[PDB]
Amino acid sequence: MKIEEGKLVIWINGDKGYNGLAEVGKKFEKDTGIKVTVEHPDKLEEKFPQVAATGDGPDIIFWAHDRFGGYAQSGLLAEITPAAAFQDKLYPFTWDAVRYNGKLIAYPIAVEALSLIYNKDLLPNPPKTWEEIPALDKELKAKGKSALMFNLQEPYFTWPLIAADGGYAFKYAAGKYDIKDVGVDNAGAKAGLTFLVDLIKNKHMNADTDYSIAEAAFNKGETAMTINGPWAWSNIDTSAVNYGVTVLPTFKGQPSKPFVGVLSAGINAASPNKELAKEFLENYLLTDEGLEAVNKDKPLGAVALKSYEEELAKDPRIAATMENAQKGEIMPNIPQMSAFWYAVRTAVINAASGRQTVDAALAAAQTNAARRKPSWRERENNRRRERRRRAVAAKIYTGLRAQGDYNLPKHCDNNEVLKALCVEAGWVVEEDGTTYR
Amino acid sequence: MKIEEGKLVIWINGDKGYNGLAEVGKKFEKDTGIKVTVEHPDKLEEKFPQVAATGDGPDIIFWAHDRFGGYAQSGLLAEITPAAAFQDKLYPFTWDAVRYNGKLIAYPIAVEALSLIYNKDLLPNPPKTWEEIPALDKELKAKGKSALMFNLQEPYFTWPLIAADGGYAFKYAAGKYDIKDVGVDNAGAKAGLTFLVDLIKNKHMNADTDYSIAEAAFNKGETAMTINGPWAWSNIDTSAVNYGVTVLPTFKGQPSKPFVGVLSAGINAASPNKELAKEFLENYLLTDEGLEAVNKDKPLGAVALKSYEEELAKDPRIAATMENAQKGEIMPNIPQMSAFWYAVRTAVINAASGRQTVDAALAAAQTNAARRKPSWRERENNRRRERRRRAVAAKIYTGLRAQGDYNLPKHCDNNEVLKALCVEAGWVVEEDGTTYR
DNA sequence: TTGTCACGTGACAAA
DNA sequence: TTGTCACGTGACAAA
Ligand SMILES: OC[C@H]1O[C@H](O[C@H]2[C@H](O)[C@@H](O)[C@@H](O)O[C@@H]2CO)[C@H](O)[C@@H](O)[C@@H]1O
Numbered sequence: 051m052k053i054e055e056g057k058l059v060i061w062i063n064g065d066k067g068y069n070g071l072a073e074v075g076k077k078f079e080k081d082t083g084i085k086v087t088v089e090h091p092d093k094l095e096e097k098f099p100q101v102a103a104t105g106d107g108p109d110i111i112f113w114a115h116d117r118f119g120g121y122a123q124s125g126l127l128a129e130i131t132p133a134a135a136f137q138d139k140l141y142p143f144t145w146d147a148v149r150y151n152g153k154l155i156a157y158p159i160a161v162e163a164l165s166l167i168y169n170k171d172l173l174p175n176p177p178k179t180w181e182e183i184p185a186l187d188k189e190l191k192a193k194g195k196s197a198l199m200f201n202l203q204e205p206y207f208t209w210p211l212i213a214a215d216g217g218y219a220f221k222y223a224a225g226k227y228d229i230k231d232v233g234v235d236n237a238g239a240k241a242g243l244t245f246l247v248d249l250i251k252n253k254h255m256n257a258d259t260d261y262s263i264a265e266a267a268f269n270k271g272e273t274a275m276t277i278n279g280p281w282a283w284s285n286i287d288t289s290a291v292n293y294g295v296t297v298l299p300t301f302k303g304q305p306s307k308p309f310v311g312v313l314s315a316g317i318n319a320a321s322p323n324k325e326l327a328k329e330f331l332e333n334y335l336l337t338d339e340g341l342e343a344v345n346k347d348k349p350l351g352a353v354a355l356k357s358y359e360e361e362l363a364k365d366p367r368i369a370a371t372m373e374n375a376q377k378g379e380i381m382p383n384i385p386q387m388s389a390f391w392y393a394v395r396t397a398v399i400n401a402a403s404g405r406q407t408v409d410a411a412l413a414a415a416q417t418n419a420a421r422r423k424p425s426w427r428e429r430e431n432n433r434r435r436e437r438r439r440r441a442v443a444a445k446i447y448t449g450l451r452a453q454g455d456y457n458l459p460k461h462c463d464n465n466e467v468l469k470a471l472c473v474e475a476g477w478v479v480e481e482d483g484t485t486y487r
Numbered sequence: 488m489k490i491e492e493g494k495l496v497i498w499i500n501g502d503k504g505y506n507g508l509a510e511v512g513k514k515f516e517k518d519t520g521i522k523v524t525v526e527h528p529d530k531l532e533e534k535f536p537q538v539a540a541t542g543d544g545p546d547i548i549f550w551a552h553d554r555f556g557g558y559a560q561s562g563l564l565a566e567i568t569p570a571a572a573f574q575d576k577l578y579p580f581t582w583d584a585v586r587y588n589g590k591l592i593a594y595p596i597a598v599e600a601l602s603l604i605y606n607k608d609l610l611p612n613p614p615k616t617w618e619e620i621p622a623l624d625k626e627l628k629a630k631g632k633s634a635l636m637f638n639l640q641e642p643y644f645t646w647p648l649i650a651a652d653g654g655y656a657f658k659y660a661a662g663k664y665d666i667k668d669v670g671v672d673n674a675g676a677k678a679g680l681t682f683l684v685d686l687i688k689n690k691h692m693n694a695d696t697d698y699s700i701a702e703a704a705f706n707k708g709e710t711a712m713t714i715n716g717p718w719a720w721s722n723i724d725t726s727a728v729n730y731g732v733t734v735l736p737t738f739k740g741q742p743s744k745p746f747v748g749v750l751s752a753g754i755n756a757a758s759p760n761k762e763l764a765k766e767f768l769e770n771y772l773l774t775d776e777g778l779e780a781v782n783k784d785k786p787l788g789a790v791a792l793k794s795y796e797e798e799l800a801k802d803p804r805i806a807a808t809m810e811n812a813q814k815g816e817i818m819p820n821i822p823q824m825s826a827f828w829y830a831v832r833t834a835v836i837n838a839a840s841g842r843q844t845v846d847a848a849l850a851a852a853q854t855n856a857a858r859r860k861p862s863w864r865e866r867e868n869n870r871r872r873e874r875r876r877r878a879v880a881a882k883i884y885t886g887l888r889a890q891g892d893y894n895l896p897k898h899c900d901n902n903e904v905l906k907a908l909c910v911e912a913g914w915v916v917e918e919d920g921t922t923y924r
Numbered sequence: 925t926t927g928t929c930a931c932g933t934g935a936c937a938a939a
Numbered sequence: 940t941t942g943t944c945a946c947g948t949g950a951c952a953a954a
């Protein structure tokens with residue numbers, strides 16, 4: 051698709067309150083006549099960098115802040131320049147999450163952190179440690195149910211356990227993240243992953259479990275516990291499960307450390323509606339009424355707007371979310387975050403499945419998470435080099451065929467031309483290419 | 488995932504009533520103690536052939552009958568052996584849809600055909616032809632609405648228009664489909680796709696429109712018409728739209744001809760639960776109570792079970808579905824169907840976006856749809872030949888380097904060795920490889 | 925059908 | 940960093 055003047059198109063993930071956001075777009079359309087379309091395409095965080103490099107893509111893209119640094123580095127986002135009065139309306143730390151190279155690259159919307167979600171009727175007192183989950187599963191499997199089910203296909207869900215005993219993504223020292231210092235293969239990381247793999251090995255969890263499978267099992271009452279964000283609450287509400295939201299379990303006595311995301315809205319640098327997009331985000335979405343409309347669809351978490359977070363913070367589920375977020379860390383927004391996520395995703399799936407040992411999967415993840423992506427010019431240099439190597443050889447064999455007058459078959463390959471040249475120069479070449487004088 | 492003895496895992500597309508099917512599973516578990524898990528993974532029709540070739544995948548897979556011929560050719564499905572008494576409970580033509588090389592390869596469930604769905608409040612009198620839609624759109628645009636929106640990313644939804652004036656997939660002759668006689672590039676197909684592309688050029692439809700975009704627009708009352716199947720009805724029921732289901736519009740005075748699919752259930756040849764699978768399908772799903780539970784979730788269309796179809800056929804929406812189905816054709820189940828669908832999908836998306844002209848897109852689609860997929864042995868033949876060609880050349884240059892005494896630099900490529908050979912044999916080689924005596 | 929050479933990126937290594 | 944050769948499939952042709 052392509053941006054065009056007078057209309058706004060928004061991309062937001064399918065697990066957020068896109069219908070609520072569409073209502074805000076409707077009030078925006080009535081007040082100034084600009085149509086707003088909200089769409090929730092799949093793999094939007096991957097599609098955007100592909101289409102925006104050529105000027106395509108939506109007017110506004112919603113995602114957690116961790117992806118936006120890469121978009122900025124690639125020149126895909128318009129610089130955000132809110133007035134002092136508006137900046138004052140959001141918590142300063144949410145602005146930090148969307149600052150890259152000293153510039154604001156998106157509007158922060160809400161703070162997301164994973165929590166432990168449990169079925170009060172099935173589990174009145176949830177466990178406080180990861181280590182007691184296996185025994186709890188034995189007891190619950192006797193009654194037909196299971197202890198815990200969560201998304202094992204996305205490392206965002208498994209990261210809190212991996213990070214608990216010492217795993218880290220990029221080390222932060224002296225005011226910066228060190229891109230070549232990766233903590234995915236240390237003792238803490240290995241221990242956390244090993245415990246997860248052992249749960250699968252001991253049949254307390256299934257390796258192929260994904261978001262829908264886990265959500266269904268918990269919402270239908272088949273599993274005592276799940277790990278998810280604030281967005282998931284709405285479906286649990288409509289179900290018949292009585293749920294609580296609490297702190298994630300400890301592992302080896304240390305807290306689970308979730309990677310904290312700030313749902314953010316960036317403006318396509320290619321959009322001709324940048325002023326309209328600011329007006330929508332600043333004066334319609336980032337307001338009490340606008341955030342409420344979205345939050346009523348699927349909870350946003352701890353919103354960045356001070357005025358409305360004071361209402362939401364009363365919710366004990368948001369309080370547990372922020373308890374988990376205090377034990378966690380705000381994600382970096384550096385461009386290498388995407389390579390880190392792919393690396394850890396492959397490590398978790400490969401170890402959970404048995405295709406690799408935990409040691410082998412995390413060793414590869416460390417290499418992949420620090421690997422430097424070659425530049426376009428480096429790729430073109432390689433391409434051109436091979437083009438040149440083949441052209442030189444082809445000219446040589448063209449000359450040999452035309453002027454050699456070798457005793458060659460009607461149709462033969464260049465290897466047979468090489469052989470005829472070898473014999474003419476005093477060599478004997480055997481059938482397999484063994485060559486000598 | 489691998490299937491375990493004593494439990495059933497089912498795969499079914501996410502637009503079908505998987506929750507209703509899960510209720511049927513809970514009854515199977517209640518009466519036999521065998522757990523049944525229903526999952527709806529993305530791209531399941533593509534994942535199944537990849538994982539099932541090695542014994543992985545579900546016990547049962549649901550999809551339209553057109554993919555099952557390919558699965559059966561690759562040995563992925565267990566042969567279906569219903570007693571004659573059971574076969575008599577289903578309409579004969581639905582058994583034909585799942586017969587491949589004389590054998591039954593799946594249980595037929597329901598007959599699906601696309602229909603025109605319209606908003607009666609915005610559009611009391613639906614249009615009878617495609618040709619009048621552009622004018623209808625102009626009128627509705629003055630009211631802040633649009634005429635028609637439907638999924639342009641899947642060729643299933645555009646095929647009824649392409650086939651209307653004479654487009655066909657594979658010609659049927661002498662009791663068989665001719666896999667080399669493809670009709671995606673004839674005058675009828677061109678006329679149909681040109682009309683669709685012209686709708687986009689005159690701003691009556693958007694090229695990026697997909698399933699979710701079209702469903703939301705119709706179910707929120709923003710567009711007067713959509714094209715979809717019976718599965719979509721239940722979401723329209725809960726919405727505020729008062730809708731009708733009617734015959735698809737004519738094009739050039741000829742009826743739109745949808746490709747008719749038979750939702751079918753195949754049994755993984757790797758399952759050790761083939762008898763449990765057969766018991767579940769025959770005695771629990773393909774029953775009045777069984778299909779009712781799935782139909783209440785998301786309508787199946789015209790079910791293959793005569794006893795329950797007598798009830799469902801009373802519904803005017805099913806009558807419209809079968810009116811469209813009579814004007815269409817049952818899809819072939821031959822293995823080439825997947826290559827046909829991929830080709831037409833590319834043709835539609837490339838023409839709708841302007842990346843290719845209608846004639847260029849459909850010319851390419853005809854070639855790709857008729858192309859013979861090289862066998863594994865043909866690919867292996869090619870791989871080994873080039874491996875051998877490189878190995879012979881490597882041995883020649885190994886011997887030249889070791890016994891040549893060519894006065895070469897410390898590091899050089901094989902082209903430089905070849906040049907030394909040439910000069911030794913009485914040739915002169917320029918820098919670009921120009922070689923003469 | 926088999927067969928030649930092109931193609932751009934991967935595995936590896938010297939520096 | 941630059942640089943070699945491998946790698947399997949594509950474009951094209953003889954038959
Ligand atoms: O799993 C890797 C993934 O983690 C985060 O994605 C979260 C996202 O922040 C949440 O809003 C929610 O949608 O769940 C996602 C995980 O499925 C990162 O933001 C993302 O970049 C990363 O790929």
Ligand SMILES: OC[C@H]1O[C@H](O[C@H]2[C@H](O)[C@@H](O)[C@@H](O)O[C@@H]2CO)[C@H](O)[C@@H](O)[C@@H]1O
Nearest residue numbers: 500502551553554641642643644748828
């Ligand atoms: O678009 C190509 C696609 O068409 C059919 O898929 C249908 C399916 O039969 C319906 O049940 C429903 O889910 O819509 C699908 C299209 O999105 C063919 O059955 C399928 O093989 C083909 O790829």
